[PDB]
Symmetry: C3
Subunit: 369 residues, 3 copies
């Protein structure tokens, strides 16, 4: 039929757009379906910026984690007393708290910058706004909302200087071209206290799962990553090779919003739903760059890569999650069922079952076909 | 009138049933009443299985705690890399995480098995499904939802072997008869790492409250029981003797779903509700085996046993809960009011009040009448 | 137009009232607006009692923090096994758990007592009831909801003694006049274990922010204040001098319900809202004694005092909150933006911007005008 778990990149709507770039926000997941109530406070944003461009300073009333999907950026985060600028490469993530100003430079000369954000609103479930201190074609300065006298006392200056220096619309919108020299100066302080936390490499150590057909890196809510711990969340980076298949599996407790960063493939997701009688229903999707889908906890999925597929996953309800497989040797929960219980449940004997299950001696990722 | 806090066992609906057993699920508590919004993510399940039967392997997209209400079971829990089987007797509880496969054997020869489950959905508030890897009359294997080619690559075998060994409906449903010998072999590994946590005896130590008329055991969210701590929940086992009355009391912060495992009795629950004017309303219930009722925090209740009454309680919002009484010597909050404040609030003097309150020198449970 | 963030004290409704005092409860914040869903479980109560009066014993099915806005009280908290009485002065807060009985004496001879409460319901989001063990004109004893036989067994006495001593309506309502001598005796045990936690002085140490124009004390969720830690909440006390202006600022993650305890002023709050196009909208309010308003996270606000203004703030989502300013020297996030990024976003050069920003060498609070 159709698939509530699949949001093609056409379901994103641009919030700000121009020659320089565009910030698109995926619709609220519970506008879709009541199945995604638990996911309503998580909005996905994708930013694309051209070379030598900057997304201008803003803060949001939402807690953010930002990931570089493609290219090189310098991201700067500021609070009331401090600032930190980080050179980020693809696969590096950075948390940006609510109310902290940030801006994003595309460091690269010829490559576009693609960035994925998960945004967690603080005031109203599933809704947030960006607050820009400068004016532009797309939006006014929030300082304009203050009265003339309030502004005059605040800055200790007349309304005329303030407006001309700060308030005026200055036009190309919220993503702007930057000179070669200016990019040099914006990058000067960059790194390759105060809740301004350092970036993390999603691919930092060994992958949890690795074979000739596929790779899975994961950062868990850990003593190692207290921020993830505070948010009960994990960050996952999957690489499936062209012609490979990630075996049927599921996450035991985590719900995962998956973004497709590069490549093409085919999603299989199995659910149990009410017609009283409960039926297995299969859901499929032709995955493409920019797409998003939702992997609910405990629901089987398998993914087939028609080209090299790169998937970034934001997990919710992460703590103690187990990614459990249904085939192959490693992490195979069916293997773990007692023989005698295999005999009673399946049509084959326990011996047949165990024999058939051991046919597949590879784990996790295999050759499609 | 009628009672929103009381769910007679007729309000359970069978999800799977047969000669062997039946799994009944109590309706969603907020389908009832908006008073139970805080309880919407908790569904109660009761399983009854006959001797020498097994509930077949399944996982659910819900976090579970299971309690033995009557009889002897062997419960096995499995994840991707591990398995543990436990002989459980009445009063023993076991947590089964989301996405972990389990199955339930009735160890006993002639006695039925009664099991109570509280299920906490992960994907959609108040709704969950069971996922069976084998097919049957009642439900299909979720492997059927995968494509032929996906299955063939996964198991490294043709569709024909897979379907015949695994996929085929093999019929008597999800609870099956088991041979005397097979029960021996399923019990072989049983006990009388990996988030597979051991069972707990609800009645393990001394009871918190004990007297000739009644008993109350409780397991609290504790350093001793970190799982309970993580879930902010407690598990309570009450025994009220025939002809006894549990004194008017309430839990200070916890909301408790109470299941009646054995016996008969009479529930009194007092609420304050809006007609502006606030009025005391009394709610009553003839308690019987299988019944469920809801004890909201801070609402007075008293229970009268017409036969020996056994009650199992699942507490939510447990941490720092106080079960506070309104009569008797122990835990009597009215006693604790200053004399002078007693004098000002009640019609009697402070002296009379204190005199009348000390008439009852027993605590918690007394003789009804 | 009109202002959803502003609740004038006329929006409070009295729940109990009389010559002695009145308890008014502010309406549910989400009856207002869907913007305040995250604030639905927080109800504000204001109590005013005349000299030598007592609010009678009650418990609620809500967790409470109580603050003295004006005057002197003795507040007593009781559970099943213990009692503690505290002399509270203005600026002192006290937590009262759900289900714990409390009562409030106005210690003072000629001064009225004003008390602010934030109430966090436990059973049903945004709704709670008070449970009085004594009867009165305004409400019945909850003991009346128990049957005659239940009561007789409980207290070990006949229905006649019980009713006359305890049950009878004894009339002036829930706030009562108290003799000079009785106030002496109710104060005897007062202080100037068991989850009965001591009061805290909101103004206890140094203020976080201090200058000739203004003061801000804050108690944070801290190892120092584990209760606040458990609730993820902070308590804030602001003093703005007559003719002063608190500079444009916002809280990075916290949402704050602010109560006006004394004085008059003018609130400016800036939001971003949808007309697609996002626009700055300004919201204003003439603040007066008793008023409440809501400061959502990340939304700019400035406050102007026309007389000496005292504001008490209940923060939600507190942990790691940053109160960030937009002008002045201290805590100015705009200062923190890189010069080159200032140059690109604002109309003025980076130099002008930085020059104009340094015009204001005071921090936080300045002279209005
Ligand atoms: Cl996955
Ligand atoms: Cl109880
Ligand atoms: Cl503030």
């Amino acid at each position: 039929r159709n698939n509530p778990f699949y949001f093609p990149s056409r379901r994103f709507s641009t919030r700000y757009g121009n020659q320089n770039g565009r910030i698109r926000v995926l619709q609220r997941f519970d506008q879709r379906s009541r199945q995604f109530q638990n996911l309503q406070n998580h909005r996905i944003v994708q930013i694309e910026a051209k070379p030598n461009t900057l997304v201008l300073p803003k803060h949001a009333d939402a807690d953010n984690i930002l990931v570089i999907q493609q290219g090189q950026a310098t991201v700067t985060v500021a609070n009331g007393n401090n600032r930190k600028s980080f050179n980020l490469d693809e696969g590096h993530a950075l948390r940006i708290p609510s109310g902290f100003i940030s801006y994003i430079l595309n460091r690269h000369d010829n490559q576009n910058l693609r960035v994925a954000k998960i945004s967690m609103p603080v005031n109203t479930p599933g809704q947030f706004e960006d607050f820009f201190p400068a004016s532009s074609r797309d939006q006014s300065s929030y300082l304009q909302g203050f009265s003339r006298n309030t502004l005059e006392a605040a800055f200790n200056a007349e309304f005329n200087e303030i407006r001309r220096v700060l308030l005026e619309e200055n036009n190309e919108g919220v993503i702007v071209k930057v000179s070669k020299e200016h990019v040099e100066e914006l990058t000067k302080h960059a790194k390759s206290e105060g809740d301004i936390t350092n970036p993390i490499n999603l691919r930092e150590g060994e992958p949890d799962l690795s074979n000739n057909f596929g790779k899975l890196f994961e950062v868990k809510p850990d003593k190692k990553n207290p921020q993830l711990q505070d948010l009960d969340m994990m960050l996952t980076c999957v690489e499936i090779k062209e012609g490979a298949l990630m075996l049927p599996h599921f996450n035991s407790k985590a719900m995962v919003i998956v973004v497709v960063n590069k490549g093409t493939g085919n999603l299989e997701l199995v659910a149990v739903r009410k017609e009283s009688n409960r039926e297995v229903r299969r859901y499929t999707a032709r995955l493409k760059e920019g797409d998003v889908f939702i992997m609910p906890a405990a629901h089987p999925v398998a993914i087939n890569a028609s080209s090299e597929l790169h998937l970034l996953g934001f997990g919710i309800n992460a703590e103690n999650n187990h990614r459990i497989f249904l085939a192959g040797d490693k992490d195979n929960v069916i293997d773990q069922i007692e023989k005698q219980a295999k005999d009673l449940a399946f049509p084959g004997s326990g011996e047949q079952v165990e024999k058939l299950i051991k046919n597949q001696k590879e784990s996790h990722f295999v050759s499609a076909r």
